[PDB]
């Protein structure tokens, strides 16, 4: 059922996205490609950056390595260690006499990698970088926020590698520079630097009032350095190092076309460069005419994306010195015995600062490959958060006017969220090629076969917004055009002959990301609608069953494809295969097997899996399945029937509500997988094992399933059941009194391993995919020092949807089950089919506007047209289009019914009746004619399987899609008693079983005092709290019987006041009147 | 801790000498793989003892009250203590005091003090003989009214 | 809300002051021997679940329909807090 | 009795000792090389030095103690600070300080 | 005006943990204390570092260590004094930030408490009885009750003595 | 109500020469339906040599009469040289919808 809807396709969705990540991987990263080309970038760079470390005495740095993975993949993640790739890099030393002894690459250390996926894996958890973005350099100048004095802001190279200049406009000194951090007169600065009187005055330009300091070019030299840290000029300008802008723009093309024309490497290299074409602007730029003083205004063309090739490897830079002068400590102590190119270099301080880093640098958010896409978005996302300046959650003196919206297409306006918003996001489909490298650049379209991208920058010549055309050129005589921000009317260039040097939507897609052109009539709802939906999309769940959208954009083409979730193939065809758990081969490059999945584990739950497609031979081209997929058509959910309306309020706010036959069938319910980790170090005095010779507790309940520790695959669990008993020897609290008494009275004479078990945490029901053995001097285990064993056992559970579970579509309208019903009931279609879903108004439809429902009507016209569709973007799919199709629909299930067995009937009848009063149907031919209209957009009758009646009222039906969310229930809840009881704190927290919670810290508070529930009140910080007798004095006092629990004694407080003590304090507990003196804790 | 230059000179061995493998290997040396590096005695689990027990670990200290866990004097605990012993106190009704008060001094119950079965016989008048028999003669009489009213579970505590 | 909630509040000088007394007037009433309410026949609340009946175990809800029957005061009466015990041995 | 008005304020170095009242000074080995507890100076358990023999003189009646080496019927097993307070002692006897003297200029600085 | 001191005070009890297993790492250690010795060891090393004749100069530098080393257990707020030393990082708990300031301890332990049989749940609604009637599930719900559910059971059926009782909600 | 395999340990597990995967398996025998003659029967069990390459479905289980299966086609597998398949159903009769809590 291909019913396309599209008109004019030209490009490709960006072939294919995933690049953000390579695009550090590789162009980035030399590595696998000869050692001699590659500029500097990245890593080159660095290296000669970074001076040989300096005392003859004299490291050099020459040539790398890399490759050789020490563990392959797979491995890895059956243990852990990162899919770390190891390199080297030959130093041969200078010094004295015949200076060199070019060692071996001095044997260097590993590096993580970059699966061709699209992320990473460490120890054992595939995750990810993620972007940075910032103002990039060149020269601002930035418009006076203080007071209307327009002055300058100077650059960084990049965060971390530079000081930020500035040349204020102030008054008690006529320009005070501002380096990094610093305020001086800049004129005190142009002195030490040849120019000085005459040379700079006269030339170029509160002058030089204070000329009394232009004279000798060194009385600043040490001038200046007075008033700096305590009371320098080795960098800041002088050598290559600290301030020095570069790479090939910014860096480096920020002067040569904004600057005027003169470049250099940096700025003052003391020889001026760049500290003359910046203040002799200002001065023919205040006042003068060459305004252009364009601020950042978060503009695009002043902001830089940044591929990790960057985000680390800079990083790389400051590390591959941790080490410089952490080996000069080497040139001086340790006599030669113990001195050469490969005595110094040792891998412990430069892994480090890299590996302290892709395991917890905030960023790396660990991947969310929950469903194919999610994961993909988080190769993309990107932030100006983490640790480039831009930086805390709800403010630093300015966040909220900021990062607000801007003047960049070239990204979605609906994907934040509400938080730290803004400060994320994601780029969109047509963006970033060619030099993604610097600056996003989204492609253009000018009237033919040539296309044009120079930045999401060019604002030059104004483009059109796809609308109207016909073989090249439309007609409008209106070209709905655009230029920079406002949407003039147009001007038709005029010639066909390209663009008005580029103007086209391209297509119209091109404005959103991907998380986003996937939606339905997302052309018509909110946009706040939209986002609370662009995102529930990152999160769903393989619903095993999966269906791919009646409606839906082919982009799903891609989605699975480019973030590979299903298969593919390769030139040749030709199957054969045993299906089963692997694949046929080829025939082209000979044959070749194909393993896939079984179920596997993943970053949260989703538990991917992989069944597939075949038989014998075809070779287009897929191949397999994907998690949550259908024949290459990215399926995420399950669209099965709906219809607007309520009953018994049983969807009041904003709720659903399912019918049981949505289990029958089986069809939503889904998989996650749990890792339980569980150990045994081994002190000194008990030493922790796993023989499934349990003590005290001897059962069937264990021998039978357990047995010899590891419990066999295919064993059901429940709360509380062994996973893997255990031992410990162990002896905390030596034996007791009386109950010696029992010991013995029952004859199980005593204990010597205290139970230590691991036991199914609070509650977890399920099966067994697995398990897993480990252990200590064993060549591949890395396991933690001191240890031996790591028992790992795999547990995962077919879900299923009880009560709670969140369901929510795809135009924004979040589930929350209400009382799924029992077929009897529900809305039977006069031909039986009953409403599988239903999805009262109200909350968000009347309220935050969505369009949506066209996803309903033209819906019906699938169960009965039979006909699936494709919906594309601000085009095609509208409100005439569903009627077309609305039409041989009616023709058609009316048919049945008036050639099986009738036509008209009371019920469906009547009800037409208020169709007329109502203000709908047209008072004309028999029931047929006006039966039908009701279809069209309304939807047919309709009774109810409650009393029986018809539901007046032309209600709506139309299978559409729901989805069903992460948000479970059985993973979302906590409930529990006395359960923690956790230590130092003496307040809930605590339980090699339990580990819930609940605070009442605060507000929680308030409200309840708002009230006299004193008794109530207290309660909470009496017993109930960290009372601890009185903790006991409750259990103790119900258990036993009735009895109001003892009045109370704090605790928490008791601390305090030690707390306090601690300092010079004291806290007479002072008694009533005055001289009664109480002092109460002090032993009872 | 406590360092002797019994660790730190030879952390700084399996340290500079991990380190000198290294450059001389490519890849991360195991710990028995250094024991030859070393020498006697240098097998594997001494060279795991040793960076096991410091060099500048002990944690960072507090990041993230930054770890709860608990078992100190358990709350459900010191309640189901305050039971078992008014139990037995109740499950000692049904007794007599030349067998009750027998066992309480014998197994200890009375106060503490787990008297021998002389300081039992001394008191109480007759020689062991009778007594021994008094002693057995609990234990049944006290299990045999258990199978046929359940508290056997207070084991578990 | 309260069987009769309507002729509490304003009956007392003040909420509180309200809810203070009756929850006193239930420990001490049916957590002081059962038998010890006001009510004589079988306006003694009650509750018929589901076979078999008995007198709601939560006591609290005695004491609200307890103040419904003349009987009871309230207020700065008999200091000896104690002698509250007076009659524990009268109802032993 | 029962609570009410809540003192506190100052409490002279004379005080410190009262609560300090003994325990302190010495090093503070964070445990040994080797049985991680102890170092019979810093978190000592008061009187406890691998076996002391005594200090549960102070205490009346209750229970039994002395158990010679190892432990006895100390806290260290049960009842350990009990989460209650326990004041050490400092050696403190060199020159000055300033407990913070705060940030108002008080406690001198107006004086 | 005894502010001047003589005898800083330091607790020991609230350190002495010990080591912390699951997922992926365990090692165990605390703060106050590695930020405590600074002190002892100064004031130790003084007293001893002088009985040895150290002439001026020295002296003070030394002793006026302790000054800075009290400023310590106090409130870490001037220059920092980083754990990791040289260690470019974080700020040694030392009643500032944590304990008595704000959001850590006392901010924390005056109402941010916590009940004991609270708990958690999702969210729904449809006709019962409306007000004084609420959701609430079967299990879920048992344990808070827990407690007197062995009550009743006693003397009316169920079990004989409390003692099983959970025994029985395995 | 009630099935197994014999090379197979558990629902969420792969089985050998065979696309289907258990899951799937039963995900299509849930729609088998059958008819029992007589009324003494209480629920009865279902065999299939299920071997080597073919199409197998339904029919091609035990031929015991007594019970038949008003359904025919119905593919069940699709194995492909792995073969391999005999199974134990066991069959039941009720009213309702009874899921993962009447384990047969
Ligand atoms: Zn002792």
Same mark, same amino acid.
């Given at each position: 059922?291909?019913?396309?809807?599209?008109?004019?396709?030209?490009?490709?969705?960006?072939?294919?996205?995933?690049?953000?990540?390579?695009?550090?991987?590789?162009?980035?990263?030399?590595?696998?490609?000869?050692?001699?080309?590659?500029?500097?970038?990245?890593?080159?760079?660095?290296?000669?950056?970074?001076?040989?470390?300096?005392?003859?005495?004299?490291?050099?740095?020459?040539?790398?390595?890399?490759?050789?993975?020490?563990?392959?993949?797979?491995?890895?993640?059956?243990?852990?260690?990162?899919?770390?790739?190891?390199?080297?890099?030959?130093?041969?030393?200078?010094?004295?006499?015949?200076?060199?002894?070019? @060692?071996?690459?001095?044997?260097?250390?590993?590096?993580?990698?970059?699966?061709?996926?699209?992320?990473?894996?460490?120890?054992?958890?595939?995750?990810?970088?993620?972007?940075?973005?910032?103002?990039?350099?060149?020269?601002?100048?930035?418009?006076?926020?203080?007071?209307?004095?327009?002055?300058?802001?100077?650059?960084?190279?990049?965060?971390? &590698?530079?000081?930020?200049?500035?040349?204020?406009?102030?008054?008690?000194?006529?320009?005070?520079?501002?380096?990094?951090?610093?305020?001086?007169?800049?004129?005190?600065?142009?002195?030490?630097?040849?120019?000085?009187?005459?040379?700079?005055?006269?030339?170029?330009?509160?002058?030089?009032?204070?000329?009394?300091?232009?004279?000798?070019?060194?009385?600043?030299?040490?001038?200046?350095?007075?008033?700096?840290?305590?009371?320098?000029?080795?960098?800041?300008?002088?050598?290559?190092?600290?301030?020095?802008?570069?790479?090939?723009?910014?860096?480096?093309?920020?002067?040569?076309?904004?600057?005027?024309?003169?470049?250099?490497?940096?700025?003052?290299?003391?020889?001026?460069?760049?500290?003359?074409?910046?203040?002799?602007?200002?001065?023919?730029?205040?006042?003068?005419?060459?305004?252009? @003083?364009?601020?950042?205004?978060?503009?695009?063309?002043?902001?830089?994306? +940044?591929?990790?090739?960057?985000?680390?490897?800079?990083?790389?830079?400051?590390?591959?010195?941790?080490?410089?002068?952490?080996?000069?400590?080497?040139?001086?102590?340790?006599?030669?015995?113990?001195?050469?190119?490969?005595?110094?270099?040792?891998?412990?301080?430069?892994?480090?600062?890299? &590996? @302290?880093?892709?395991?917890?640098?905030?960023?790396?958010?660990?991947?969310?490959?929950?469903?194919?896409?999610?994961?993909?978005?988080?190769?993309?996302?990107?932030?100006?958060?983490?640790?480039?300046?831009?930086?805390?959650?709800?403010?630093?003196?300015?966040?909220?006017?900021?990062?607000?919206?801007?003047?960049? +297409?070239?990204?979605?306006?609906?994907?934040?969220?509400?938080?730290?918003?803004?400060?994320?996001?994601?780029?969109?489909?047509?963006?970033?090629?060619?030099?993604?490298?610097?600056?996003?650049?989204?492609?253009?379209?000018?009237?033919?076969?040539?296309?044009?991208?120079?930045?999401?920058?060019?604002?030059?010549?104004?483009?059109?917004?796809?609308?109207?055309?016909?073989?090249?050129?439309?007609?409008?005589?209106?070209?709905?055009?655009?230029?920079?921000?406002?949407?003039?009317?147009?001007?038709?260039?005029?010639?066909?002959?390209?663009?008005?040097?580029?103007?086209?939507?391209?297509?119209?897609?091109?404005?959103?990301?991907?998380?986003?052109?996937?939606?339905?009539?997302?052309?018509?709802?909110?946009?706040?609608?939209?986002?609370?939906?662009?995102?529930?999309?990152?999160?769903?769940?393989?619903?095993?069953?999966?269906?791919?959208?009646?409606?839906?954009?082919?982009?799903?083409? +891609?989605?699975? +494809?480019?973030?590979?979730?299903?298969?593919?193939?390769?030139?040749?065809?030709?199957?054969?295969?045993?299906?089963?758990?692997?694949?046929?081969?080829?025939?082209?490059?000979?044959?070749?097997?194909?393993?896939?999945?079984?179920?596997?584990?993943?970053?949260?739950?989703?538990?991917?899996?992989?069944?597939?497609?075949?038989?014998?031979?075809?070779?287009?081209?897929?191949?397999?399945?994907?998690?949550?997929?259908?024949?290459?058509?990215?399926?995420?959910?399950?669209?099965?029937?709906?219809?607007?309306?309520?009953?018994?309020?049983?969807?009041?706010?904003?709720?659903?509500?399912?019918?049981?036959?949505?289990? *029958?069938?089986?069809?939503?319910?889904?998989?996650?997988?749990?890792?339980?980790?569980?150990?045994?170090?081994?002190?000194?005095?008990?030493?922790?094992?796993?023989?499934?010779?349990?003590?005290?507790?001897?059962?069937?309940?264990?021998?039978?399933?357990?047995?010899?520790?590891? /419990?066999?695959?295919?064993?059901?669990?429940?709360?509380?059941?062994?996973?893997?008993?255990?031992?410990?020897?162990?002896?905390?609290?030596?034996?007791?009194?009386?109950?010696?008494?029992?010991?013995?009275?029952?004859?199980?004479?005593?204990?010597? /391993?205290?139970?230590?078990?691991?036991?199914?945490?609070?509650?977890?029901?399920?099966?067994?995919?697995?398990?897993?053995?480990?252990?200590?001097?064993?060549?591949?285990?890395?396991?933690?020092?001191?240890?031996?064993?790591?028992?790992?056992?795999?547990?995962?559970?077919?879900? *299923?949807?009880?009560?709670?579970?969140?369901?929510?579509?795809?135009?924004?309208?979040?589930?929350?089950?209400?009382?799924?019903?029992?077929?009897?009931?529900?809305?039977?279609?006069?031909?039986?089919?009953?409403?599988?879903?239903?999805?009262?108004?109200?909350?968000?439809?009347?309220?935050?506007?969505?369009?949506?429902?066209?996803?309903?009507?033209?819906?019906?016209?699938?169960?009965?047209?039979?006909? &699936?569709?494709?919906?594309?973007?601000?085009?095609?799919?509208?409100?005439?289009?569903? *009627?077309?199709?609305?039409?041989?629909?009616?023709?058609?299930?009316?048919?049945?019914?008036?050639?099986?067995?009738?036509?008209?009937?009371?019920?469906?009848? @009547?009800?037409?009746?208020?169709?007329?009063?109502?203000?709908?149907?047209?008072?004309?031919?028999?029931?047929?004619?006006?039966?039908?209209?009701?279809?069209?957009?309304?939807?047919?009758?309709?009774?109810?399987? &409650?009393?029986?009646?018809?539901?007046?009222?032309?209600?709506?039906?139309?299978?559409?899609?729901?989805?069903?969310?992460?948000?479970?229930?059985?993973?979302?809840?906590?409930?529990?008693?006395?359960?923690?009881?956790?230590?130092?704190?003496?307040?809930?927290?605590?339980?090699?079983?339990?580990?819930?919670?609940?605070?009442?810290?605060?507000?929680?508070?308030?409200?309840?005092?708002?009230?006299?529930?004193?008794?109530?009140?207290?309660?909470?910080?009496?017993?109930?709290?960290?009372?601890?007798?009185?903790?006991?004095?409750?259990?103790?006092?119900?258990?036993?019987?009735?009895?109001?629990?003892?009045?109370?004694?704090?605790?928490?407080?008791?601390?305090?006041?030690?707390?306090?003590?601690?300092?010079?304090?004291?806290?007479?507990?002072?008694?009533?009147?005055?001289?009664?003196?109480?002092?109460?804790?002090?032993?009872? | 801790?406590?360092?002797? $230059?019994?660790?730190?000179?030879?952390?700084?061995?399996?340290?500079?000498?991990?380190?000198?493998?290294?450059?001389?290997?490519?890849?991360?040396?195991?710990?028995?793989?250094?024991?030859?590096?070393?020498?006697?005695?240098?097998?594997?689990?001494?060279?795991?003892?040793?960076?096991?027990?410091?060099?500048? =670990?002990?944690?960072?200290?507090?990041?993230?009250?930054?770890?709860?866990?608990?078992?100190?004097?358990? =709350? $459900?605990?010191?309640?189901?203590?305050?039971?078992?012993?008014?139990?037995?106190?109740?499950?000692?009704?049904?007794?007599?005091?030349?067998?009750?008060?027998?066992?309480?001094?014998?197994?200890?119950?009375?106060?503490?003090?787990?008297?021998?079965?002389?300081? $039992?016989?001394?008191?109480?008048? $007759?020689?062991?003989?009778?007594?021994?028999?008094?002693?057995?003669?609990?234990?049944?009489?006290?299990?045999?009214?258990?199978?046929?009213?359940?508290?056997?579970?207070?084991?578990?505590? | 809300?309260?069987?009769?909630?309507?002729?509490?509040?304003?009956?007392?000088?003040?909420?509180?002051?309200?809810?203070?007394?009756?929850?006193?007037?239930?420990?001490?009433?049916?957590?002081?021997?059962?038998?010890?309410?006001?009510?004589?026949?079988?306006?003694?609340?009650?509750?018929?679940?589901?076979?078999?009946?008995?007198?709601?175990?939560?006591?609290?809800?005695?004491?609200?329909?307890?103040?419904?029957?003349?009987?009871?005061?309230?207020?700065?009466?008999?200091?000896?807090?104690?002698?509250?015990?007076?009659?524990?041995?009268?109802?032993? | 009795?029962?609570? #009410?008005?809540?003192?506190?304020?100052?409490?002279?170095?004379?005080?410190?000792?009262?609560?300090?009242?003994?325990?302190?000074?010495?090093?503070?080995?964070?445990?040994? #090389?080797?049985?991680?507890?102890?170092?019979?100076?810093?978190?000592?358990?008061?009187?406890?030095?691998?076996?002391?023999?005594?200090?549960?003189?102070?205490?009346?009646?209750?229970?039994?103690?002395?158990?010679?080496?190892?432990?006895?019927?100390?806290?260290?097993?049960?009842?350990?600070?009990?989460?209650?307070?326990? #004041?050490?002692?400092?050696?403190?006897?060199?020159?000055?300080?300033?407990?913070?003297?705060?940030?108002?200029?008080?406690?001198?600085?107006?004086? | 005006?005894?502010?001047?001191?003589?005898?800083?005070?330091?607790?020991?009890?609230?350190?002495?943990?010990?080591?912390?297993?699951?997922?992926?790492?365990?090692?165990?250690?605390?703060?106050?204390?590695?930020?405590?010795?600074?002190?002892?060891?100064?004031?130790?090393?003084?007293?001893?570092?002088? %009985?040895?004749? %150290?002439?001026?100069?020295?002296?003070?530098?030394?002793?006026?260590?302790?000054?800075?080393?009290?400023? %310590?257990?106090?409130?870490?707020?001037?220059?920092?004094?980083?754990?990791?030393?040289?260690?470019?990082?974080?700020?040694?708990?030392?009643?500032?930030?944590?304990?008595?300031?704000?959001?850590?301890?006392?901010?924390?332990?005056?109402?941010?408490?916590?009940?004991?049989?609270?708990?958690?749940?999702?969210?729904?609604?449809?006709?019962?009885?409306?007000?004084?009637?609420?959701?609430?599930?079967?299990?879920? %719900?048992?344990?808070?009750?827990?407690?007197?559910?062995?009550?009743?059971?006693?003397?009316?059926?169920?079990?004989?003595?409390?003692?099983?009782?959970?025994?029985?909600?395995? | 109500?009630?099935?197994?395999?014999?090379?197979?340990?558990?629902?969420?597990?792969?089985?050998?020469?065979?696309?289907? !995967?258990?899951?799937?398996?039963?995900?299509?025998?849930?729609?088998?339906?059958?008819?029992?003659?007589?009324?003494?029967?209480?629920?009865?069990?279902?065999?299939?040599?299920?071997?080597?390459?073919?199409?197998?479905?339904?029919?091609?289980?035990?031929?015991?009469?007594?019970?038949?299966?008003?359904?025919? !086609?119905?593919?069940?597998?699709?194995?492909?040289?792995?073969?391999?398949?005999?199974?134990?159903?066991?069959?039941?009769?009720?009213?309702?919808?009874?899921?993962?809590?009447?384990?047969?």
């Amino acid at each position: 059922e291909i019913k396309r809807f599209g008109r004019i396709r030209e490009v490709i969705p960006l072939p294919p996205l995933t690049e953000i990540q390579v695009e550090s991987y590789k162009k980035a990263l030399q590595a696998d490609v000869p050692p001699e080309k590659r500029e500097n970038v990245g890593i080159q760079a660095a290296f000669k950056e970074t001076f040989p470390i300096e005392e003859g005495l004299v490291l050099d740095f020459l040539e790398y390595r890399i490759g050789d993975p020490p563990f392959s993949q797979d491995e890895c993640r059956e243990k852990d260690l990162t899919y770390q790739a190891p390199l080297y890099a030959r130093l041969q030393l200078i010094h004295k006499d015949t200076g060199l002894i070019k @060692e071996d690459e001095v044997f260097l250390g590993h590096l993580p990698l970059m699966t061709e996926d699209g992320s990473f894996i460490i120890n054992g958890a595939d995750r990810v970088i993620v972007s940075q973005i910032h103002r990039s350099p060149g020269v601002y100048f930035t418009p006076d926020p203080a007071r209307p004095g327009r002055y300058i802001a100077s650059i960084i190279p990049l965060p971390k &590698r530079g000081p930020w200049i500035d040349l204020e406009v102030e008054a008690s000194g006529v320009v005070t520079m501002k380096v990094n951090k610093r305020k001086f007169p800049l004129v005190l600065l142009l002195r030490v630097l040849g120019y000085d009187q005459e040379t700079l005055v006269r030339e170029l330009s509160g002058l030089l009032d204070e000329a009394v300091l232009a004279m000798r070019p060194e009385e600043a030299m040490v001038r200046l350095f007075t008033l700096l840290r305590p009371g320098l000029a080795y960098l800041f300008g002088l050598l290559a190092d600290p301030k020095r802008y570069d790479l090939g723009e910014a860096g480096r093309y920020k002067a040569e076309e904004k600057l005027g024309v003169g470049l250099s490497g940096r700025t003052l290299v003391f020889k001026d460069e760049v500290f003359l074409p910046t203040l002799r602007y200002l001065f023919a730029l205040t006042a003068g005419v060459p305004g252009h @003083e364009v601020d950042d205004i978060d503009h695009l063309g002043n902001r830089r994306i +940044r591929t990790v090739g960057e985000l680390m490897a800079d990083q790389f830079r400051v590390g591959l010195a941790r080490l410089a002068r952490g080996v000069r400590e080497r040139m001086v102590m340790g006599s030669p015995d113990t001195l050469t190119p490969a005595k110094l270099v040792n891998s412990r301080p430069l892994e480090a600062a890299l &590996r @302290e880093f892709f395991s917890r640098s905030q960023l790396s958010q660990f991947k969310d490959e929950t469903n194919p896409l999610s994961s993909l978005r988080h190769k993309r996302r990107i932030s100006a958060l983490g640790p480039g300046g831009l930086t805390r959650e709800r403010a630093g003196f300015d966040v909220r006017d900021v990062h607000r919206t801007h003047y960049g +297409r070239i990204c979605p306006v609906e994907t934040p969220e509400g938080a730290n918003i803004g400060l994320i996001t994601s780029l969109a489909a047509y963006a970033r090629v060619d030099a993604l490298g610097f600056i996003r650049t989204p492609y253009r379209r000018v009237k033919n076969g040539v296309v044009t991208e120079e930045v999401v920058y060019m604002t030059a010549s104004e483009e059109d917004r796809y609308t109207i055309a016909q073989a090249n050129t439309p007609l409008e005589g209106d070209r709905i055009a655009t230029d920079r921000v406002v949407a003039r009317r147009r001007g038709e260039p005029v010639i066909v002959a390209p663009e008005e040097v580029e103007f086209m939507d391209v297509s119209p897609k091109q404005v959103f990301s991907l998380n986003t052109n996937l939606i339905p009539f997302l052309e018509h709802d909110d946009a706040n609608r939209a986002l609370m939906g662009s995102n529930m999309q990152t999160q769903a769940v393989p619903l095993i069953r999966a269906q791919a959208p009646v409606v839906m954009t082919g982009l799903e083409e +891609r989605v699975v +494809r480019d973030s590979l979730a299903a298969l593919y193939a390769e030139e040749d065809g030709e199957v054969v295969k045993v299906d089963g758990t692997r694949i046929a081969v080829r025939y082209e490059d000979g044959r070749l097997v194909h393993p896939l999945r079984r179920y596997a584990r993943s970053n949260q739950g989703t538990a991917f899996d992989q069944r597939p497609r075949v038989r014998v031979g075809q070779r287009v081209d897929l191949l397999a399945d994907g998690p949550a997929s259908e024949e290459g058509f990215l399926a995420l959910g399950q669209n099965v029937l709906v219809a607007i309306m309520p009953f018994d309020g049983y969807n009041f706010e904003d709720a659903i509500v399912i019918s049981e036959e949505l289990l *029958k069938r089986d069809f939503y319910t889904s998989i996650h997988i749990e890792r339980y980790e569980i150990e045994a170090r081994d002190t000194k005095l008990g030493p922790e094992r796993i023989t499934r010779d349990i003590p005290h507790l001897s059962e069937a309940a264990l021998r039978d399933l357990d047995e010899e520790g590891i /419990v066999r695959i295919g064993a059901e669990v429940k709360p509380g059941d062994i996973l893997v008993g255990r031992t410990s020897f162990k002896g905390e609290q030596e034996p007791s009194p009386e109950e010696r008494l029992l010991r013995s009275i029952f004859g199980e004479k005593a204990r010597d /391993v205290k139970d230590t078990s691991l036991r199914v945490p609070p509650g977890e029901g399920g099966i067994v995919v697995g398990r897993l053995r480990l252990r200590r001097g064993d060549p591949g285990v890395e396991l933690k020092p001191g240890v031996r064993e790591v028992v790992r056992v795999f547990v995962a559970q077919k879900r *299923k949807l009880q009560v709670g579970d969140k369901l929510a579509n795809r135009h924004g309208n979040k589930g929350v089950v209400a009382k799924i019903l029992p077929v009897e009931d529900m809305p039977h279609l006069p031909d039986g089919t009953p409403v599988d879903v239903i999805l009262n108004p109200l909350g968000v439809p009347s309220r935050m506007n969505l369009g949506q429902i066209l996803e309903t009507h033209l819906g019906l016209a699938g169960y009965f047209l039979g006909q &699936r569709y494709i919906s594309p973007v601000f085009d095609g799919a509208t409100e005439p289009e569903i *009627k077309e199709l609305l039409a041989e629909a009616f023709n058609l299930y009316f048919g049945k019914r008036q050639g099986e067995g009738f036509g008209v009937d009371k019920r469906e009848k @009547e009800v037409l009746a208020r169709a007329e009063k109502l203000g709908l149907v047209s008072p004309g031919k028999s029931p047929e004619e006006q039966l039908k209209e009701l279809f069209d957009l309304g939807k047919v009758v309709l009774y109810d399987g &409650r009393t029986g009646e018809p539901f007046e009222g032309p209600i709506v039906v139309g299978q559409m899609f729901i989805m069903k969310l992460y948000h479970m229930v059985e993973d979302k809840m906590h409930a529990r008693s006395t359960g923690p009881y956790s230590l130092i704190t003496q307040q809930p927290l605590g339980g090699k079983a339990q580990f819930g919670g609940q605070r009442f810290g605060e507000m929680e508070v308030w409200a309840l005092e708002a009230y006299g529930a004193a008794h109530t009140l207290q309660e909470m910080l009496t017993i109930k709290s960290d009372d601890i007798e009185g903790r006991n004095a409750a259990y103790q006092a119900i258990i036993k019987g009735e009895d109001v629990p003892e009045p109370s004694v704090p605790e928490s407080f008791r601390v305090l006041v030690k707390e306090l003590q601690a300092l010079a304090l004291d806290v007479q507990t002072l008694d009533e009147k005055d001289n009664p003196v109480d002092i109460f804790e002090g032993l009872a | 801790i406590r360092i002797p $230059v019994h660790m730190v000179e030879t952390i700084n061995k399996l340290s500079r000498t991990a380190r000198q493998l290294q450059q001389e290997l490519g890849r991360e040396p195991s710990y028995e793989e250094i024991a030859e590096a070393m020498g006697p005695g240098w097998d594997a689990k001494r060279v795991e003892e040793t960076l096991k027990i410091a060099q500048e =670990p002990v944690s960072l200290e507090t990041p993230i009250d930054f770890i709860p866990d608990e078992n100190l004097p358990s =709350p $459900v605990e010191a309640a189901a203590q305050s039971l078992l012993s008014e139990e037995l106190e109740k499950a000692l009704s049904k007794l007599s005091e030349r067998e009750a008060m027998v066992l309480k001094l014998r197994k200890g119950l009375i106060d503490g003090r787990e008297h021998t079965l002389e300081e $039992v016989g001394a008191y109480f008048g $007759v020689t062991r003989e009778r007594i021994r028999q008094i002693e057995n003669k609990a234990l049944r009489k006290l299990k045999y009214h258990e199978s046929r009213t359940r508290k056997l579970r207070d084991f578990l505590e | 809300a309260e069987p009769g909630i309507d002729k509490l509040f304003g009956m007392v000088d003040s909420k509180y002051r309200l809810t203070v007394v009756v929850a006193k007037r239930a420990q001490q009433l049916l957590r002081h021997r059962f038998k010890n309410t006001v009510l004589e026949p079988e306006e003694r609340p009650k509750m018929r679940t589901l076979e078999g009946l008995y007198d709601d175990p939560n006591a609290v809800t005695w004491a609200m329909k307890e103040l419904l029957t003349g009987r009871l005061f309230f207020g700065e009466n008999l200091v000896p807090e104690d002698r509250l015990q007076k009659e524990m041995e009268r109802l032993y | 009795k029962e609570v #009410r008005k809540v003192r506190i304020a100052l409490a002279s170095p004379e005080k410190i000792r009262s609560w300090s009242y003994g325990e302190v000074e010495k090093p503070e080995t964070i445990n040994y #090389r080797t049985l991680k507890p102890e170092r019979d100076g810093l978190f000592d358990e008061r009187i406890f030095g691998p076996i002391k023999d005594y200090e549960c003189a102070c205490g009346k009646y209750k229970r039994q103690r002395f158990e010679g080496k190892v432990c006895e019927r100390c806290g260290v097993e049960v009842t350990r600070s009990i989460v209650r307070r326990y #004041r050490m002692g400092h050696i403190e006897l060199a020159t000055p300080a300033a407990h913070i003297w705060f940030v108002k200029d008080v406690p001198s600085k107006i004086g | 005006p005894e502010w001047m001191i003589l005898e800083a005070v330091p607790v020991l009890p609230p350190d002495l943990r010990p080591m912390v297993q699951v997922d992926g790492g365990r090692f165990a250690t605390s703060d106050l204390n590695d930020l405590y010795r600074r002190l002892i060891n100064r004031n130790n090393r003084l007293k001893k570092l002088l %009985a040895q004749g %150290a002439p001026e100069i020295i002296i003070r530098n030394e002793k006026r260590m302790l000054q800075e080393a009290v400023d %310590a257990v106090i409130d870490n707020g001037r220059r920092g004094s980083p754990v990791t030393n040289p260690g470019s990082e974080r700020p040694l708990r030392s009643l500032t930030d944590i304990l008595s300031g704000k959001q850590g301890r006392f901010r924390q332990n005056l109402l941010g408490k916590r009940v004991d049989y609270s708990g958690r749940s999702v969210i729904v609604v449809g006709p019962q009885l409306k007000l004084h009637q609420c959701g609430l599930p079967k299990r879920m %719900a048992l344990e808070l009750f827990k407690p007197f559910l062995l009550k009743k059971m006693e003397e009316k059926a169920f079990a004989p003595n409390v003692k099983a009782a959970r025994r029985m909600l395995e | 109500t009630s099935v197994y395999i014999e090379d197979v340990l558990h629902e969420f597990s792969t089985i050998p020469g065979v696309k289907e !995967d258990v899951v799937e398996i039963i995900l299509n025998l849930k729609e088998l339906v059958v008819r029992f003659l007589d009324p003494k029967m209480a629920s009865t069990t279902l065999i299939l040599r299920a071997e080597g390459p073919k199409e197998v479905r339904a029919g091609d289980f035990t031929p015991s009469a007594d019970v038949e299966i008003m359904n025919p !086609d119905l593919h069940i597998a699709t194995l492909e040289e792995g073969g391999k398949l005999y199974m134990e159903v066991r069959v039941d009769r009720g009213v309702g919808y009874v899921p993962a809590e009447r384990h047969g």
